[PDB]
Design a protein around this ligand. Structure first.
Ligand SMILES: Cc1cc2nc3c(=O)[nH]c(=O)nc-3n(C[C@H](O)[C@H](O)[C@H](O)COP(=O)(O)O)c2cc1C
Ligand SMILES: Cc1cc2nc3c(=O)[nH]c(=O)nc-3n(C[C@H](O)[C@H](O)[C@H](O)COP(=O)(O)O)c2cc1C
Ligand SMILES: O=C(O)c1ccc2ccccc2c1
Ligand SMILES: O=C(O)c1ccc2ccccc2c1
Ligand SMILES: [K+]
Ligand SMILES: [K+]
Ligand SMILES: [K+]
Ligand SMILES: [K+]
Ligand SMILES: [Mn+2]
Ligand SMILES: [Mn+2]
Lengths: 496, 496
């Protein structure tokens, strides 16, 4: 089965790519696996596969770190992401994001139910497992718990059965048969929880599947629209109906080749201590413990030789940057276009810790709008910051046709030189804010509201008559014939 | 004579360092030399020495490009700058800026007058030279003239003789015996021009010396205080009195080993067409011609085999970044400390196109101030943005003790995660602005006023009780013994 549709096949693809290091000597899930993984992410090294984890009992479990992190080379920088999607490993970010958006104007391809799959090879009932006795990693030294859940798929369904949501949200072990985790607005796991709580009859039937089909974990990380079942969107994106098997203890369906499946309920009443956690912006606030949602685990099923994927998240560059940022930016691009805004491309620069999105403007179309910076800034911010796709993003940077938004250097150059602080910006204080950003949840202002800005790095004539500068760079400040002569004579003259 | 005190010796030092490429085949000063230089700066290659310039007549002239640009290696990244100052080529930016600040609390060492020097080897009077017949470079394809002056030293003196200023300011050829250039407030060449214009008696006696002592061109690029004679400050910084020779046609003094000396006057009445020019922020606005100051050239003296230094300025990274930004930041650091602000370090991040300065705060001292973000932001901005040293800088970023301001990645991380847009910022609209920044001179607002901001990336507890986070990075989120094990076993496990 293909790498994009089967996690076990994806691990083999990383091996064949020489993009894996198999560590067959004992590694401690208490910090060591995540430390190795963290160093990998900070240095764009090969993904580590920990085949010998201290505390692995009855096939639970191996760990793959850095499943969606970057490669060292520019030529296949995004190759792990490309391996999630059946794309060539040399795929550009534009090509990855266009693949992730391709299902947005296709009919869903609903999933196919099969009677069994590898995820049923082993099972443990409510008398046979203890989540405190599994080799769950301690990812950061001050974490408030062992974070079993960084790269699995929560599966919850609306009470009426019409929407089944797949998403990533963190969770840690609370006791032998419970997790706690973040369930916050406006996330779809929270929207669905709210539906069950207002019905008031029962806890939310739930499953958490780890090592799901790579194309499914990408959609799990993407803010596709409210009410859209991720299974059908991944089906349309891949052109293949996903095979799912029923859970043993509830009527939800999990990917048939899931490495590890937890079945149980998400409580509509109970909470427990959650966090702190070393998070995507690069911080942990030690002893910052809050109350989180509480999950009850009734059953575990798993593959022989099961592999748990793990994100050791924090400072650049890991899955919280390459997937959270980039996939939000893709949905923002589409959202702007659907609102008749002349946006061609969007990307969350890694240098902004994926708190900015750079929006490339088709300035020919902008000129035909006969508008102004203040007006256009206001319109773009109202569209993006009042939508769920804009949740994690606190600064939008508008740039003209000459900027490649996928090149952080060029975004920073445009931002720094074409946007006058204050005058070329509009602040948004009455929009939902992302509290995980330290200046929000641990800052001077409301944790959940405001602190957003649209920064216009379009120059004045981009709205009227056209770009009125040339860059003072090799590309733009010299004629073609000269540039080519210089390049052709470069090593002859003595340069490197 | 030592490399820091003699430009010819500095060129030999770059050769011996394997940091030079001598191009002995003919190179066109019309764009080709500057294109090669531009590519060098964009790729941190070796400095080009053009020994065979098309149009060189009677020893005028060779060109050295990229005299203060970066080297490829991290280990000697700033080695060219270190060669300006007698520092080891492995010098850090902190060490370079501390050397440039060292004269600020020393008695000046006045210059020594000598009767002759290499700069008198050749001369051309008012009947013998034609500036349009020299191989003056066209640096960018849309420049409004041939910019003879990018890395020479203007020498002007107050009418009362008590202050002699050395500075870099651009100038281009106007006709056979005149230049035009930018003379703008608050620059010292402009302050002195104003003194002569209010006296009203005569044009300003002037000289422009190219290929001056490297330590002297660094001070020329630094905003040392009003009324301070750069010669005495370089003397104190180097511990050696600079040897100067009198001009032939006026009573100014030039460095004895100057490669090329123009003598004449800066007009208190005349102007001429100046620019456009490909400038430090990375832009040219073609046909943007303004009126500039007008210089009359009465005499040229020069060394046998004279070498003209040239900055091919624009996008990263050249002398307009490494010297303008860094030397402003050094003077800002000192200015803050003199105003009892607890600043330890300052640097202008290259990623900001040197329009930001990051200020590292001693947060133990900050806590003893018992102050707030708004108050402290306001105080720092009032100090820096109402002083000449803050002129080119439009954003200040305040960061705590954990940030290395010399590491752009860490500044961007702190800025992006610890400064809430709007709430944690103070805008300054009633301060002098830098019109060369495109969002100023070609923007939506007043070209010369406002558009400045203090961005506070100090977290709330940095003002009260102390940092209350750990980074989610390899360094901070794992214990020492574990980190060292991981590093010691890194190649054994299979990593690069
Ligand atoms: C490694 C990783 C960790 C994540 N952690 C969280 C988290 O703890 N909580 C959260 O709400 N979203 C988290 N996300 C992001 C969500 O997956 C993303 O916002 C997605 O759009 C949610 O799905 P939904 O649109 O169906 O709600 C994470 C994503 C990744 C790649
Ligand atoms: C390559 C280069 C080009 C420069 N061009 C200019 C310029 O055209 N005009 C200007 O006023 N300053 C220019 N500067 C900056 C000044 O040298 C700097 O602001 C210095 O502080 C001026 O000296 P002063 O403090 O004695 O006025 C340049 C510096 C460098 C390194
Ligand atoms: O509970 C977090 O660490 C976290 C991380 C990333 C997140 C991304 C989008 C929404 C919520 C998020 C929460
Ligand atoms: O006339 C410019 O291109 C220019 C370049 C750098 C400058 C630096 C400080 C002050 C003025 C400046 C002017
Ligand atoms: K999703
Ligand atoms: K703008
Ligand atoms: K100076
Ligand atoms: K702050
Ligand atoms: Mn969803
Ligand atoms: Mn001066």
């Amino acid at each position: 089965q293909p790498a994009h549709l089967c996690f076990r096949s994806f691990v083999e693809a990383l091996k064949v790519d020489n993009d894996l290091v198999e560590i067959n000597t004992p590694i401690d899930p208490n910090l060591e696996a995540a430390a190795i993984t963290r160093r990998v992410c900070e240095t764009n090294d090969k993904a580590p596969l920990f085949n010998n984890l201290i505390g692995m009992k009855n096939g639970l479990f191996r760990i793959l770190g850095a499943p969606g992190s970057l490669r060292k080379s520019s030529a296949d920088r995004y190759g792990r992401l490309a391996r999630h999607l059946a794309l060539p490993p040399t795929a550009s970010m534009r090509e990855i994001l266009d693949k992730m958006l391709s299902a947005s104007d296709m009919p869903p391809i609903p999933p196919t139910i099969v009677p069994t799959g590898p995820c049923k090879e082993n099972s443990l009932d409510d008398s046979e497992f203890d989540l405190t006795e599994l080799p769950v990693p301690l990812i950061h030294k001050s974490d408030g718990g062992k974070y079993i859940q960084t790269y699995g798929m929560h599966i919850v369904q609306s009470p009426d059965g019409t929407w089944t949501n797949w998403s990533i949200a963190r969770a840690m072990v609370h006791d032998k048969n419970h997790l706690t985790g973040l369930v916050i607005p406006p996330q779809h796991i929270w929207q669905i929880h709210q539906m069950w709580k207002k019905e008031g009859r029962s806890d939310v039937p739930w499953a958490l599947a780890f090592g799901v089909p790579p194309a499914a974990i990408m959609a799990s990380s993407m803010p596709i629209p409210d009410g859209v079942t991720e299974a059908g969107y991944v089906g349309a994106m891949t052109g293949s109906s996903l095979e799912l098997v029923k859970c043993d203890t509830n009527d939800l369906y999990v990917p048939a080749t899931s490495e590890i499946v937890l079945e149980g309920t998400l409580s509509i009443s109970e909470t427990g201590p959650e966090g702190p956690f070393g998070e995507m912006h690069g911080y942990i606030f030690p002893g910052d413990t809050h109350l989180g949602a509480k999950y009850k685990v009734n059953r575990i099923t798993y593959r022989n030789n099961a592999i748990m994927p793990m994100s050791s998240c924090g400072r650049l560059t890991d899955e919280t940057h390459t997937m959270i940022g980039s996939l939000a930016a893709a949905e923002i691009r589409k959202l702007c276009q659907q609102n008749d805004l002349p946006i061609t491309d969007a990307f969350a620069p890694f240098e902004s810790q994926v708190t900015w999105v750079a929006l490339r403007v088709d300035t020919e179309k902008l000129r035909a709008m006969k508008t102004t910076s203040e007006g256009f800034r206001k319109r773009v911010g109202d569209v993006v910051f009042n939508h769920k796709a804009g949740y994690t993003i606190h600064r939008l940077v508008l740039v003209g046709d000459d900027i490649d938004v996928y090149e952080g250097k060029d975004v920073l150059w445009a931002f720094s030189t074409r946007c006058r602080p204050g005058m070329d910006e509009t602040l948004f204080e009455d929009v939902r804010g992302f509290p995980l950003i330290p200046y929000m949840g641990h800052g001077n202002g409301p944790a959940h509201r405001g602190g957003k800005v649209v920064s216009d790095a379009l120059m004045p004539t981009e709205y009227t008559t056209g770009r009125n500068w040339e860059a003072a760079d090799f590309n733009q400040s010299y004629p073609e014939d000269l540039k080519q002569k210089v390049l052709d004579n470069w090593t002859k003259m003595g340069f490197s």
